[PDB]
């Protein structure tokens, strides 16, 4: 954690660039969500083992 704390100094600039990444990674999840919506409970059911 110590290192990272100091890395923020330079990493700061990266943020501005990572900004777009958030939106990009979002569009990819938006689609997958369509199927994940089912697998979520579909898999949880067996996981609970009623």
- 10-16-22 Cα angle (round to 5): 120
- CA 32 to chain centroid, in Å, comes to 12
Terminus-to-terminus CA distance in the chain, angstroms?
41
The H or E element containing residue 1 is none
Range of the domain at 4: 1-50
How many domains does one find in the chain? 1
To which residue do tokens 């943020």 refer? 15
Give the separation between CA 39 and CA 33, rounded to whole angstroms: 10
């Amino acid at each position: 954690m110590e290192e990272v704390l100091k890395s923020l100094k330079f990493s700061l600039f990266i943020v501005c660039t990572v900004t777009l990444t958030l939106f990009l990674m979002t569009i990819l999840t938006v689609t997958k969500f369509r199927g994940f919506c089912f697998i979520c409970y579909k898999t949880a059911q067996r996981l609970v083992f009623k």
